[PDB]
Write an enzyme that holds these catalytic residues in place. Structure first.
Site, PDB file in Angstrom:
ATOM      1  N   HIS A  69      11.523   1.226   2.387  1.00 36.54           N
ATOM      2  CA  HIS A  69      10.289   0.718   2.956  1.00 36.54           C
ATOM      3  C   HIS A  69      10.567  -0.377   3.980  1.00 36.54           C
ATOM      4  O   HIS A  69      11.586  -1.078   3.946  1.00 36.54           O
ATOM      5  CB  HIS A  69       9.386   0.162   1.873  1.00 36.54           C
ATOM      6  N   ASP A  71       8.170  -2.595   4.782  1.00 39.63           N
ATOM      7  CA  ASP A  71       7.261  -3.733   4.568  1.00 39.63           C
ATOM      8  C   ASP A  71       8.038  -4.767   3.805  1.00 39.63           C
ATOM      9  O   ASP A  71       9.056  -4.513   3.104  1.00 39.63           O
ATOM     10  CB  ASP A  71       5.904  -3.426   3.864  1.00 39.63           C
ATOM     11  N   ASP A 102      15.686  -7.213   0.863  1.00 36.83           N
ATOM     12  CA  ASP A 102      14.654  -6.274   0.349  1.00 36.83           C
ATOM     13  C   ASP A 102      13.713  -5.862   1.450  1.00 36.83           C
ATOM     14  O   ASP A 102      12.680  -6.488   1.657  1.00 36.83           O
ATOM     15  CB  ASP A 102      13.840  -6.891  -0.798  1.00 36.83           C
ATOM     16  N   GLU A 136       5.263  -0.356   0.249  1.00 35.87           N
ATOM     17  CA  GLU A 136       5.860  -0.228  -1.077  1.00 35.87           C
ATOM     18  C   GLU A 136       5.519  -1.452  -1.917  1.00 35.87           C
ATOM     19  O   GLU A 136       5.436  -1.408  -3.126  1.00 35.87           O
ATOM     20  CB  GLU A 136       7.368  -0.156  -0.968  1.00 35.87           C
ATOM     21  N   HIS A 232      12.410 -11.796  -2.629  1.00 38.72           N
ATOM     22  CA  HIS A 232      11.046 -12.345  -2.832  1.00 38.72           C
ATOM     23  C   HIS A 232      11.078 -13.851  -2.927  1.00 38.72           C
ATOM     24  O   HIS A 232      10.215 -14.470  -3.562  1.00 38.72           O
ATOM     25  CB  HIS A 232      10.405 -11.808  -4.056  1.00 38.72           C
TER      26      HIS A 232
HETATM   27 ZN   LIG Z   1      10.410  -6.012  -3.041  1.00 39.20          ZN
HETATM   28 ZN   LIG Z   2      11.916  -3.214  -1.971  1.00 40.38          ZN
END
Ligand SMILES: [Zn+2]
Ligand SMILES: [Zn+2]
Length: 258
Positions: A69, A71, A102, A136, A232
């Site tokens: 993904h 995003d 990520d 996602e 994150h």
């Molecule tokens: Zn993530």
């Molecule tokens: Zn991810």
């Protein structure tokens, strides 16, 4: 090292785009432009506010898809960041930014690996595909699941699917993810590639919803990717040397598989 360089440059290009879910901010376009140049068939599957890409090289089965993904999650307060979150600055061997871990680093490594592979083997057995969504990380009602539905509706198959989410816990290649939430050649192929490239053996653990949906197609689904410690979080980053190794690992996986 030429290839490492390509992985890094692409990762920076992606990181610079502030693709907070479900806004793709042109990342899929960059990606489709590169693949299209190498003979990949490009199919756009937009739905509502979400952009999805299905890109394929080859005709025959087996179909090996790389999935991920574009995003990213919110940044939080910018006063907490050492480099600005979308700067894609490289500091003492670390590529910084929201998405670096990520999953834009790994996305770039999968892409470079598919390209390198196709350039060496244009007449390759089977089909190499990329399945990329712009949602996602949020509600994901219109992302990978939409693509899966679309493919299933026309009886289009995925045999194997490598989900490039950051899976490594302490050291790159230490952890691979497979199986079902509630309890083949792809696992074999990635395991060997990791062993052969960085000389350690992954532990298989029993997992993104997205992978979960692809698995409903009856694909063998495995997740492998960089260190996940910084995902994150503020000052998210990834090792450039690690991105380099990822590139090699994915390419080796294709060799092993096809
Ligand atoms: Zn993530
Ligand atoms: Zn991810």
């Amino acid at each position: 090292n030429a290839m490492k360089e390509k992985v890094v440059s692409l990762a920076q290009d992606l990181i610079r785009r502030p693709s907070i879910s479900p806004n793709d901010e042109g990342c899929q376009q960059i990606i489709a432009e590169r693949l299209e140049k190498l003979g990949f068939q490009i199919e756009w599957m937009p739905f509502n506010d979400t952009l999805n890409l299905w890109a394929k090289h080859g005709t025959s089965e087996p179909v090996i898809a790389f999935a991920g993904h574009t995003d990213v999650v919110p940044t939080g307060d910018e006063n907490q960041w050492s480099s600005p979150p979308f700067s894609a600055e490289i500091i003492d061997g670390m590529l910084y930014g929201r998405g670096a871990a990520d999953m834009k680093g790994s996305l770039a490594a999968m892409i470079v690996a598919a390209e390198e592979y196709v350039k060496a083997n244009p007449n390759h057995k089977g089909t190499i595909a990329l399945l990329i969504t712009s949602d996602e990380e949020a509600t994901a009602k219109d992302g990978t699941i939409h693509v899966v539905e679309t493919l299933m509706a026309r009886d289009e198959k995925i045999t194997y699917c490598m989900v490039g989410e950051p899976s490594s816990a302490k050291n790159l290649g230490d952890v691979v993810k497979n199986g079902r939430r509630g309890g083949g050649k792809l696992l074999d192929s990635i395991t060997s590639a990791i062993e052969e490239t960085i000389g350690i053996t992954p532990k298989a653990e029993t997992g993104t919803s997205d992978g979960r949906f692809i698995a409903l197609m009856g694909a063998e689904v495995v997740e492998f990717g960089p260190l996940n410690s910084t995902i994150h979080k503020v000052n998210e980053c990834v090792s450039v040397e690690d991105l380099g190794k990822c590139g090699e690992i994915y390419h080796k996986m294709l060799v092993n598989l096809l």
